[PDB]
Amino acid sequence: SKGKLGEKISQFKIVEELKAKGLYAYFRPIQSKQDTEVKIDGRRVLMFGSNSYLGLTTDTRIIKAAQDALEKYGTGCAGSRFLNGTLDIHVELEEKLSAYVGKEAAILFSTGFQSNLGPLSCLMGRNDYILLDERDHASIIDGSRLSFSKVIKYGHNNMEDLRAKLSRLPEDSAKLICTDGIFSMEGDIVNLPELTSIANEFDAAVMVDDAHSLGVIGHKGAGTASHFGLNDDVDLIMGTFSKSLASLGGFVAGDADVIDFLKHNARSVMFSASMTPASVASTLKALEIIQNEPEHIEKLWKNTDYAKAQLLDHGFDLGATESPILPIFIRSNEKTFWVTKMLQDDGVFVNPVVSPAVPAEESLIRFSLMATHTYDQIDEAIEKMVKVFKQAEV
Amino acid sequence: SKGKLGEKISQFKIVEELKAKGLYAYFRPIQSKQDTEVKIDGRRVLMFGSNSYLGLTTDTRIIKAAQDALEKYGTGCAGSRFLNGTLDIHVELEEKLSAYVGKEAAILFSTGFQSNLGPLSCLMGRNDYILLDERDHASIIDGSRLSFSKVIKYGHNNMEDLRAKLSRLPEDSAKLICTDGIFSMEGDIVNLPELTSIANEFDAAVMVDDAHSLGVIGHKGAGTASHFGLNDDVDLIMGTFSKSLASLGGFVAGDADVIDFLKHNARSVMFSASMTPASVASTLKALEIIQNEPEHIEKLWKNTDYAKAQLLDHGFDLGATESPILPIFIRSNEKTFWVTKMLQDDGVFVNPVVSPAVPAEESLIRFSLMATHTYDQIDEAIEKMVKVFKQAEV
Numbered sequence A, B: 001s002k003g004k005l006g007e008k009i010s011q012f013k014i015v016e017e018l019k020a021k022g023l024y025a026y027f028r029p030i031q032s033k034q035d036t037e038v039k040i041d042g043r044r045v046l047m048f049g050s051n052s053y054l055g056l057t058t059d060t061r062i063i064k065a066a067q068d069a070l071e072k073y074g075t076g077c078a079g080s081r082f083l084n085g086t087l088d089i090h091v092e093l094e095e096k097l098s099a100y101v102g103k104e105a106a107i108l109f110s111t112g113f114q115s116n117l118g119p120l121s122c123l124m125g126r127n128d129y130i131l132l133d134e135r136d137h138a139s140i141i142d143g144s145r146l147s148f149s150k151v152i153k154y155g156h157n158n159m160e161d162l163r164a165k166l167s168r169l170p171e172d173s174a175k176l177i178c179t180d181g182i183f184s185m186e187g188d189i190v191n192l193p194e195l196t197s198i199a200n201e202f203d204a205a206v207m208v209d210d211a212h213s214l215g216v217i218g219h220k221g222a223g224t225a226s227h228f229g230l231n232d233d234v235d236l237i238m239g240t241f242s243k244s245l246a247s248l249g250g251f252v253a254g255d256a257d258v259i260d261f262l263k264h265n266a267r268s269v270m271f272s273a274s275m276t277p278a279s280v281a282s283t284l285k286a287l288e289i290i291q292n293e294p295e296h297i298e299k300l301w302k303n304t305d306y307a308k309a310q311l312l313d314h315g316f317d318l319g320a321t322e323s324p325i326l327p328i329f330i331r332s333n334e335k336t337f338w339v340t341k342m343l344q345d346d347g348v349f350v351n352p353v354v355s356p357a358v359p360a361e362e363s364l365i366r367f368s369l370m371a372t373h374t375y376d377q378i379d380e381a382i383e384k385m386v387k388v389f390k391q392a393e394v
């Protein structure tokens, strides 16, 4: 019945207002492969709003691997990994990932999102604590909310606040610190040396979410622990396959005993169907290419360094990024919606960040690089961005 | 750091003990397509542990649809639906699903699991209530735990308990009842007529999780509301693509205003990558076949009715199933593990249900039918089950 339900949703008017003003640009229907140009409403649009950092969703070898796995294994496994949903190729990908990030063992999940729900829900329990950077991904706050532990946020990369909040807790309790490796909003890197120093002092477990780090930082893209040389101070490396790895799903890697506990206790792996064969095979073939072909990571960073330099030279106000995410400040929700739509209509795709996710005065567009971007594409997008910022009086 | 973490996982010994006894049969690595026979360790095994109720993960038309979508769209969309992750084919599948289940609108999620997290986390809030059947799927309890509402369980299909618990709540609050349509443990159907009667009396929203219902009950498999004629009394129809639909992902369908709220407020769709093109195309092509080819559902039910009759004739103690799930009671955890492994070693795959998920005295194996099973396969599996039950002294 819908009386109270209708009242619950009644005050959500922003989408109605965006659509009526001709500003709405969510769920834009793409007609073509995710690439540096995408087709929307039959017209070409430059894509600077993607997480495919190495451009690999169009790699014909990765497409063929997926198509061959469909031929051999069909369209789905129709069960949890736990029961009838494990293939030899899931185990192969777990062994490959473990080697890549330098851990004993891994367990796959069918999404990145569920890869955080798993360890955050089932390791810390009653009388235990989870310590979260206040900017952690939504999936980390949700995972932590599914635990029976007490969840404590600390100031963004604030090691004094992390240390202070740990020092307050009972000794006879378990603690886990979970952080994004690269934080996607501003593109900044966790202070992993100080966080792990503090974790070592308080015997707290450390988990790093490397969604935006894999294929981006660390040796051959192996992530944030790899970037800092701190493999031995990180208990759990979590990653996703939806970004550099051009696919769908994720994993948690760590010590064999911890991963054995996880794979038999995490509701998001016991009670959800396993990755499709096609996604296993695309992830396996992408992981080979990231390691075998250093040019992908090199070109990503040459694009990043070029675009960042060009944006700062044209006088854009950038966030404190250390990554291929170039956050461009606008500091008005209205102007952020206007700039986003005007760029869309001029053939540039960027992502808006607005209230209530950030303060009005911190509203921004996110401009992300792919290895497959050309300097010509970057220049065309920045040319169009300068024009639209002028038109919008930012 | 690992001191407290090592202590947290220290008492979990069942997996160690199962493996040391030679009884362990979780995460069995399959080497072949999910089908009525699967290859494990190079030997053929009859599959009675699947959720592919219509056997469609091997349908060459569905494989070809997935392979063609890989060719056209690549391996992944590399973003949320919200941002850069929507394709024309996602929208097509939403329109198709809406028509199938007789609702205005749908939103896809990248798993069934996340399809429950979405509406249960964001519709009921502070001062509101969610009413859950005590046997609801784990994803429904987790979704409900992610809301800021008060979550109340009622007795399994106990309408007196549901009515009593609703009658206690403040009038000036919103309420949502969420139930499995077909409950997977015992294979029983929700009392949707009485539950919706009560929801109408208390103006409570109704959500039905049709994971095990789609392709199984209702007109041309359209699910539990369709089965009872109660489309107009159910606010939200949730389904999964991982079972009959042979794929990965899920959806929530309902009124356009509710679904518009969902797609812009549910963290599991805003902050998780969209379904792979291959999974969209396999789901679309499976949905066409379920409707166009009535023989699949017919054969599923002829297998179900045959196997159930044969099992009751051989004197097995079955659960109160109304579905292709035949729960076979064993009532000893030790015997449930032994029977499961002995059947595996004799070429029969079934799923154990044991403590702590059920009482020892309710431990059982789940025997699920597929449309593609033959009577000869069913007879061979039951022959082997009679032998193993004898050997195990059940």
Ligand SMILES: Cc1ncc(COP(=O)(O)O)c(CN[C@@H](CCO)C(=O)O)c1O
Pocket: A078, A079, A080, A270, A271, A272, A273, A274, B051, B111, B112, B113, B114, B116, B137, B139, B180, B184, B209, B211, B212, B240, B241, B242, B243, B248, B249, B250
């Ligand atoms: C009623 C209901 N609702 C939702 C789900 C989650 O859907 P999934 O994420 O597609 O697996 C399941 C998942 N069932 C299987 C997992 C494989 O689908 C299980 O619990 O073993 C379910 O039974």
Ligand SMILES: Cc1ncc(COP(=O)(O)O)c(CN[C@@H](CCO)C(=O)O)c1O
Pocket: A051, A111, A112, A113, A114, A116, A137, A139, A180, A184, A209, A211, A212, A240, A241, A242, A243, A248, A249, A250, B078, B079, B080, B270, B271, B272, B273, B274
């Ligand atoms: C740090 C981190 N951790 C986990 C996730 C979830 O991974 P996903 O389920 O593969 O999308 C994301 C998802 N990021 C995108 C969604 C598409 O990947 C977003 O929040 O818009 C993330 O940024």
